From Swiss-Prot, chains A, C:
It comes from Bacillus cereus (strain VD045). Component of antiviral defense system Gabija type I, composed of GajA and GajB. Has no detected ATPase activity. Expression of Gabija type I in B.subtilis (strain BEST7003) confers resistance to phages phi105, phi29, rho14, SpBeta and SBSphiC. Expression of Gabija type I in E.coli B (strain ATCC 11303) confers resistance to phage T7. Transmembrane segments: none annotated. The chain holds residues 2 to 137 of 578 of the full protein. This is Endonuclease GajA. Disruption phenotype: When this gene is missing the Gabija type I system does not confer resistance to SpBeta in B.subtilis. ATP binds at residues 33-37. Coiled coil: none annotated. The gene is gajA.
Swiss-Prot record, chain B:
Disruption phenotype: When this gene is missing the Gabija type I system does not confer resistance to SpBeta in B.subtilis. When this gene is missing the Gabija type I system does not confer resistance to T7 in E.coli. One of its GO terms (molecular function) is DNA binding. The keyword Ribonucleoprotein does not apply. The record marks 146, 149 as: Interaction with GajA. Keywords: Antiviral defense, ATP-binding, Helicase, Host-virus interaction, Hydrolase, Nucleotide-binding. It comes from Bacillus cereus (strain VD045). Component of antiviral defense system Gabija type I, composed of GajA and GajB. Expression of Gabija type I in B.subtilis (strain BEST7003) confers resistance to phages phi105, phi29, rho14, SpBeta and SBSphiC. Expression of Gabija type I in E.coli B (strain ATCC 11303) confers resistance to phage T7. May be a helicase or contribute to GajA activation. This is Gabija protein GajB. GO terms for biological process: defense response to virus; recombinational repair. InterPro entries: DNA_helicase_UvrD/REP, P-loop_NTPase, UvrD-like_ATP-bd, UvrD-like_helicase_C.
Length: 138, 493, 138
């Protein structure tokens, strides 16, 4: 009954592999102040244009390893489409990136591979109904 | 040798044989030229099958030079046809075309242009000897000035694998890039006719370059390049043609001979613990001539705590034109983790996603169990009918027999095991690290099994252990050691 | 004999409509200190990724008029392709965006239209052999 299902963070800073379920209202707390801040930044990189244009530095990669790719996936639930107005907002922009067989789910992913010569790994945003064949967000 | 091969920066024509000697040198030659050249020019390697292109890309590493690693069909499509077809033929022709290999065969070059102009697809030629895509790509380059400028600006050298299978239209484009665009060509091929050819292969164009080309620099590769020098000397002494290439060494350590006095399992323990010339942690494989000789050795070792799995030679293990592809069809049927994309990678050309779905539909009939021998034969004919390849009668029965029983499942298993035992014919292809053989198997005086013995000796990579079961075997060594005045060619324990 | 032909700057800051011929080595000077700085920034916006990601503000539009679109075009000469190595650099990336009829010339343009609701006009980079049907740089 919530649009926001769960978020997956792979190889981003201190997040080796972390899966967190979500809801509309989320509160994060704990001893690790670094983990809470990186959690919010991981969401900004996926959704905030201003913080996303700067790309990934060497430090953002987990344990400063540029071989491993950074991956941030946000799983969404579109089952309540009939009575949720904000769900229809997403449908109107996604257009044909959804399939009818998996119409209840939609993925929003962030993939990053590092280039040694360019000293800079860009942020590629993909979305789609199936996690296997995600397509680049136009 | 190979050090002389990589130093040459001009047009290189390489004669490769015995397998794997072509792939390792190709990757090393590519990555070495990338390190020497700092300019913006890139390289382009083309392979017939998609697996070979993916195999080269994995060993090279990062391709930040913009280097192209892919299929021959995918190269001319993405780099020549698709970008500059509108420049060459006008805005009437599409750049979003979809190439289908199996459908829309036509008789004349003019007919295929209409299929591309109106039906918006790129179809193959009906004649297997004539390639329409390469005829189109060569035509586009001559028509389009930008097409010639881009190819020269992007690539300074082009690597070609398995050149003996290239057709004449495919050969014309490569020579056009060398003669007109002055692009360096690194060519790798097998001069022997062999068993495996692409449906439009003509070995004469490759053979003709070896005979009459003054631009290319010809080179040759050793058959047993991966084997160490000591194992090479022991293998080459049995065949007269091979005895001339080997050079004697002052000390021999890799080839071990031990007379079989104790039981078979005790010889294995003696070599592993008393002399430590074989490591139990390294892969160890034993050679036999027949399946019964492997079973008795496998059963004798299970009693002594040794665990072993034995790969038997399948009916498909036979030098036939479609043996390599038929085995891959079995691997897709037997193993669930083996993807359909892995099977499509072995098929020549870069098949589209729609064409992959049609081939997958034909093979899915073999995934149902207990559907008898008749249906397996028709699915096989339907499969190879799409590929325009006829199938040998014994190839069909060999494929069928493997499908019925689980006897040959582990021979096509994707999993890999450390300690195994294989027949001389079981692994005629793949090579092993350390191998132990027995002398009583091979008749050396009349050279009946010298070919099987030479194969047996060339399988071992690092350490070879020979059991001196036959006196006639040891006599043939000592007799030829006197003809060549060789004091040591073997290390005896 | 020079790759850099001329640059056109339309409706960018104090540049209403300005056409300047160019060469490989260029020196700019004069009384208008604002024009010299905006000239270099106009080149950075076209070619510098770091300065281009920030987009155009309301102040960057000429006379603070958001109706008029900002346009910066760089005309290039590819006639010396046979003996210029840096010319072949550009050809290798442009690929099919050139036509053989106008193979000697190549255009690199920057177009910007302002959105009132988004308060932000993005930078769209187009190139091509013909100035009429420039295509978005991939």
């Amino acid at each position: 009954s919530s649009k926001f299902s769960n978020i997956t963070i792979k190889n981003f800073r201190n997040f080796e592999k972390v899966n967190i379920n979500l809801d509309n209202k989320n509160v994060i707390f704990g001893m690790n102040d670094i983990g809470k801040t990186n959690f919010l930044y991981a969401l900004r990189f996926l959704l905030d244009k201003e913080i996303r244009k700067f790309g990934f530095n060497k430090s953002d990669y987990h344990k400063h390893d540029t071989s491993k790719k950074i991956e941030i996936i946000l799983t969404l639930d579109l089952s309540n489409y009939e009575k949720d107005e904000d769900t229809k907002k997403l449908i109107s922009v996604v257009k044909g990136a959804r399939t009818s067989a998996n119409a209840d789910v939609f993925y929003i992913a962030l993939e990053s591979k590092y280039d040694d010569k360019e000293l800079y790994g860009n942020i590629i945003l993909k979305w789609g109904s199936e996690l296997d064949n995600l397509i680049d967000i136009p | 040798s190979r050090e002389q091969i990589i130093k040459d920066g001009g047009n290189i024509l390489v004669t490769a044989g015995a397998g794997s000697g072509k792939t390792t040198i190709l990757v090393s030659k590519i990555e070495a030229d990338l390190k020497e050249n700092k300019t913006h020019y890139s390289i382009a390697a083309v392979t017939f099958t998609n697996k070979a292109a993916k195999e080269i890309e994995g060993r090279l590493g990062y391709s930040s030079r913009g280097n192209f690693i892919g299929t021959n069909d995918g190269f001319v499509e993405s780099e020549i046809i698709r970008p500059f077809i509108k420049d060459a033929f006008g805005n009437d022709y599409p750049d979003n075309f979809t190439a289908e290999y199996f459908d829309n065969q036509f008789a004349s070059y003019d007919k295929g242009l209409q299929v591309l102009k109106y039906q918006n697809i790129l179809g193959t030629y009906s004649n297997p000897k004539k390639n329409f895509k390469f005829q189109l790509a060569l035509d586009i380059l001559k028509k389009s000035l930008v097409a010639r400028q881009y190819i020269f600006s992007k690539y300074f050298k082009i690597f070609i694998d398995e050149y003996q299978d290239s057709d004449k239209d495919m050969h014309n484009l490569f020579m056009y890039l060398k003669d007109q665009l002055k692009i360096k060509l690194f060519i790798v091929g097998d001069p022997k006719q062999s068993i495996y050819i692409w449906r439009g292969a003509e070995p004469e164009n490759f053979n003709g370059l070896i005979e009459n080309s003054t631009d290319f620099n010809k080179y040759h590769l050793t058959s047993n390049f991966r084997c160490c020098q000591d194992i090479q000397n022991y293998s080459n002494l049995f065949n007269e043609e091979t005895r001339s290439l080997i050079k004697e060494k002052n000390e021999v350590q890799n080839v071990i001979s031990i007379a079989d006095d104790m039981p078979i399992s005790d010889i294995l323990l003696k070599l592993t613990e008393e002399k430590q010339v074989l490591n139990i942690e390294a892969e160890l494989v034993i050679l036999v001539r027949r399946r019964n000789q492997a079973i008795e050795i496998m059963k004798e070792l299970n009693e002594e705590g040794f665990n072993f799995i034995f790969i038997p030679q399948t009916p498909l293990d036979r030098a036939t034109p479609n043996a390599t592809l038929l085995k891959e069809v079995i691997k897709y049927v037997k193993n669930d983790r083996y993807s359909i994309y892995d099977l499509a990678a072995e098929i020549v050309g870069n098949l589209s996603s729609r064409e992959i779905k049609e081939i997958q539909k034909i093979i899915n009939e073999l995934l149902v169990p207990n559907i008898n021998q008749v249906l397996i034969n028709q699915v096989l004919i339907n499969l190879f009918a799409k590929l325009e390849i006829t199938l040998d009668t014994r190839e069909i029965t060999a494929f069928t027999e493997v499908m019925m029983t689980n006897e040959f499942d582990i021979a096509f298993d994707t999993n890999e095991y450390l300690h195994k035992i294989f027949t001389v014919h079981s692994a005629k292809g793949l090579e092993f690290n350390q191998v132990i053989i027995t002398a009583s198997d091979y008749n050396v005086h009349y050279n009946r099994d010298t070919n099987e013995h030479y194969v047996a000796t060339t399988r071992a990579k690092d350490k070879l252990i020979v059991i001196m079961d036959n006196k006639k075997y040891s006599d043939y060594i000592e007799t030829l050691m006197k003809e060549l005045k060789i004091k040591n060619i073997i290390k005896s324990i």
